[PDB]
Amino acid sequence: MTPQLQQAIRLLQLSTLELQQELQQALESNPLLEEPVYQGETTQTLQDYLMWQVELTPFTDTDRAIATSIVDAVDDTGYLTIQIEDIVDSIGDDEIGLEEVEAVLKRIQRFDPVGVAAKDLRDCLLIQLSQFAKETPWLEEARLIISDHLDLLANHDFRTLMRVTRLKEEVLKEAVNLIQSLDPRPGQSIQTSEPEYVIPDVLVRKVSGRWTVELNADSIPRLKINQQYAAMGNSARNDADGQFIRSNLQEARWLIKSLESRNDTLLRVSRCIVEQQQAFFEQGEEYMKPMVLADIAQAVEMHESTISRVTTQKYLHSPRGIFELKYFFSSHVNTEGGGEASSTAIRALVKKLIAAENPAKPLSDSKLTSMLSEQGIMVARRTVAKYRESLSIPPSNQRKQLV
Amino acid sequence: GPEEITADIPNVGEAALSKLDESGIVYIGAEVTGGDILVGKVTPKGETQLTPEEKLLRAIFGEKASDVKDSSLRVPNGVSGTVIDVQVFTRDGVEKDKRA
Amino acid sequence: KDLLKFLKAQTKTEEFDAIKIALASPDMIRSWSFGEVKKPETINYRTFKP
Amino acid sequence: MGHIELASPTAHIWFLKSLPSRIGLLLDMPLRDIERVLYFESYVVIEGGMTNLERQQILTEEQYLDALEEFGDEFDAKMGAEAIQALLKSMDLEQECEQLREELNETNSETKRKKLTKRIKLLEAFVQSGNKPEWMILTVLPVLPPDLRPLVPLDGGRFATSDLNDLYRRVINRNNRLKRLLDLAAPDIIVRNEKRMLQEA
Amino acid sequence: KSDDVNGRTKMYKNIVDGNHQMEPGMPESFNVLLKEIRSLGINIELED
DNA sequence: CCAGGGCTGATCGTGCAAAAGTCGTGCCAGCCGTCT
DNA sequence: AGACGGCTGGCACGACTTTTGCACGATCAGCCCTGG
């Protein structure tokens, strides 16, 4: 209900990154508050490698210049970004038509990774079939279904495709295999990664099947009042100086104490939500109870907001996995079996059940609802439909193909 | 994402994957030479959103386009010889233990 | 522009004859720089960008 | 490459700390006194025109304390890194060089023949080169280009930089807190200690 | 074949083509040295 | 000189109701496999 | 080849939870003034 405190207790509802940052932000204001290997080896990857080939070949000044323009618009993931006409306009010419650029852009189609800088899928695959041996049984078939009738192929249906395009069920299917064993997205062939992405907070204790309030590693912003500057307080020269020093000291003590207060709160706060939830970890990701913040403040010795703020932006970590405290929040779901359920558990089960099914005859919604009722979960058919279509799981009736 | 060591990576022929296991791990006794896949493992790259071409492409193949970034072991260019045995350590609590 | 003089004007190095050395005036150092650094932070771990 | 503002003046370490005293040969001041002035003490005098005192004398904290009330605000003096810059910028080289040459050519002796031609040659080389002595004490600080100093990519947890930008971030945050404290009218002792720490960094 | 970035590439191009010529240019170590010297209160630049 | 009353700097409390997000869950529209 | 029935996906009512702004006068012991 306080200013000098209303924030001193909202200053923790953020991540430790920002906290450190704002702590530095206010670490300059208060004088008395304080806390080789240059061998970076380089590489290539279809930008420099693509450019590398450019030089070796015999391309004239006007052609070389153009080459870089198109070799630089090649998105790393696979194909180029902008259209072809774009490229003609970004040369800055009027005498140069598409034909001139066509060649230069056609010549590159056959470099390191055959199919690099293709644009609009079809051209890529089509080219790849050109460098193949013409003494290939499904050469003409594949090509015929590459220039046209691709939409149908893309669909789950294939019978309507063969009947119209003068194709048989036996040979044509095998032509598919030569189009299927053809690798679109050749641009990632010479691609690779080397990332990390990991944050620490409250770890695990691992004591007789239990992880807890453990300890704090590196998250406490060293806030020790300076003693060389504090000695001059009592022996201040003017009134100005004394006032200054005392104001800054009191605010420093305030901040010391608020930082220490924030630590402890979240320190032992990481042992009741996660305990009220001893099924998602031990048993697994399937086996999950519904939990609510309102119910968490009821279990623990504190207010709802108090606990909501501590838990927000606090990535937890157990040898079983690292998930943010706020992500544990789940709605409700009647079950009638000694405890309600959650929709995340619906989603994981839908997914593990679509994984273990017949590949040719797909599983479904009413079927999934019935399976759930068999195990004793009793949910709606909608919740399943929603949780299925939320995970970008394609329709299972459209996921069928030729076994 | 959790890059799972599979046995069906992209941008690689079946002949090269004929030495791998069902869980993706070079059979002990194989005469691995030169630079070949030893332990398949695909890193889950942040998938995109809509972008029509991907949707069409995804359906065409499936479980490959906009999925992962192949990056296995690959015997160091200049090493050869039969592979005596392979050891495998997994974090307790992880639902795996395929070849373990 | 022309897309031809911009690419050819990339290795315009001279003979570097008569290399000398002098003091750096406080007003001449600003000509070498374009901006001014104010924050000690270099890279943020959230999205991996400066 | 970039640069740092550094509103608070700061001297250079390659000068007045090598084998020959570059700032010492221009001001005829011993190395101990110059090093003591730059460390924010000994309260050296700047001008001392009307007051009965030399322009390049030393007046300790007690000396300045008991001399300020005697001469009033006429005796101006500084006790920071900018004191040397202010004392050096107010110097006539073309007028002093002729006087020094005449004194060295007229008053010849055993010890007078040496230790005096060196200063004359230094002043002549400084005048003929067109450089300015106040340029020795810099105001801004150009930073090393970032590409030439990688971050040493580690496993991923901690970057573990090449400890070349650590001095950089230290100086940056020190100058930032100094500029923030200057706007709040801090006591003289606190701001003096802070500027001393910035000079040392 | 040691420091010059465009030099090694042009040499490779000329050897693949079959010309066997050389263009000196300027190495990168001297530029790194100039950039490291300009970082202090010292001025240095190439003249003609 | 000591205890009673007034002034004032220190020190607290880390709470509480209000507006929006979330899924149980029902309704409703479009589409395809098959027998007529 | 189209109606019938299953399948599928989009949309919305409503109970419950998530979060988010609201800046407050109130209070207690040390210090200072004063009567017994």
What CATH number corresponds to the domain at position B25? 2.40.50.150
Q: Check if the beta carbon of residue D68 is closer than 8 Å to that of residue D91.
A: no
Q: Is D149 on the interface with A (CB under 8 A)?
A: yes
B59 Cβ under 8 Å from any chain A Cβ:
yes
Per 3-state DSSP, chain C is made up of helix, strand and coil in percentages (nearest 5) of 15, 10, 75
CB nearest to D3's CB, from C23, C25, C29: C29
Is residue D84 within 8 Å of residue D43, measured between CB atoms?
A: no
Residue B16 covered by a domain: yes
Helix (H), strand (E), coil (C) string for chain A: CCHHHHCCCCCCCCCHHHHHHHHHHCCCCCCCEECCCCCCCCCCCCCHHHHHHHHHCCCCHHHHHHHHHHHCCECCCCCECCCHHHHHHHHCCCCCCHHHHHHHHHHCCCCCCCCCCCCCCHHHHHHHCCCCCCCCCCHHHHHHHHHCCHHHHHCCCCHHHHHHCCCCHHHHHHHHHHHHCCCCCHHHCCCCCCCCCCCCCECCCCCCCCCCCCCCCCCCCCCEECHHHHCCCCCCCCHHHHHHHHHHHHHHHHHHHHHHHHHHHHHCCCCCHHHHCCCCCCCCCCCCCCCCHHHHHHHCCCCHHHHHHHHCCCEECECCECCEHHHHCCCCCCCCCCCCCCHHHHHHHHHHHHHCCCCCCCCCHHHHHHHHHHHCCCCCHHHHHHHHHHCCCCCCCCCCCCC
Give the structural domain span for B29.
Answer: 1-94
For residue C23, give the H/E element and its range: strand C22-23
D184: chain A residues, CB-CB within 8 Å? 244
Q: Is residue B99 part of a domain?
A: no
Chains touching chain A through at least 3 C-beta pairs below 8 angstroms are B, C, D, E
Which residues does chain C have within 8 Å of residue E46's beta carbon, measured at their own beta carbons? 14, 16, 19
User: Tokens in use for D71?
Assistant: 């001469």
Does B37 map to a domain? yes
Across the interface, of E32, E40, E41, the residue whose CB is closest to D148 is: E32
Total structural domains in chain B? 1
Chains D and C touch (3+ CB pairs under 8 A): yes
Neighboring chains of D (3 or more beta-carbon pairs < 8 A): A, C, E
In a domain, B87, yes or no: yes
Give nearest nucleotide to A346 (CA–C1'): F23
**B contact residues 7-36, partner A, Cβ 8 Å cutoff:** 10-11
A209–chain B Cβ distance below 8 A for any pair: no
Q: Two tokens at A234?
A: 């009592």
- Domain membership flag for residue B100: no
The tokens of B92 are what?
């307790």
- CA/C1' separation D2–F16 (Å): 52
CA separation for the pair B65, E26 (Å, rounded)? 46
Is residue B51 in a domain? Answer: yes
What residue has token string 């070796």? A56
Protein CA A250 to sugar C1' F5 (Å): 29
User: What are the structure tokens assigned to A304, written together?
Assistant: 């709802």
Residue at B42 is within a domain? yes
What protein residues sit with their CB closer than 7 Å to strand G? A 1-6, 10, 291-295, 304-305, 308-309, 312, 326, 329-332, 362, 364-367, 382, 385-386, 388-389, 394-398
Q: How far is CA A52 from CA A151, A240, A321, C16, in A?
A: 37, 69, 44, 30
Distance from CA of C31 to the nearest CA of E (A): 12
- State which H helix or E strand residue B69 sits in: strand B69-70
Answer whether residue B12 is part of any domain: yes
User: What angle (nearest 5°) sits at the alpha carbon of residue A85, between those of residues A80 and A90?
Assistant: 85
Method: cryo-EM
Which residues 48-87 of A have a C-beta within 8 angstroms of E? 55-56
Residues of chain A numbered 219-238 and touching chain E (CB < 8 Å): none
Structure-block tokens of residue A285: 């990701």
Contact E46, C19 (CB under 8 A): yes
Give, to the nearest 10 degrees, the angle between helix D117-128 and helix D93-106: 150
Chains D and A touch (3+ CB pairs under 8 A): yes
Are A145 and A175 within 8 A, CB to CB? yes
User: At how many Å resolution was this determined?
Assistant: 3.4
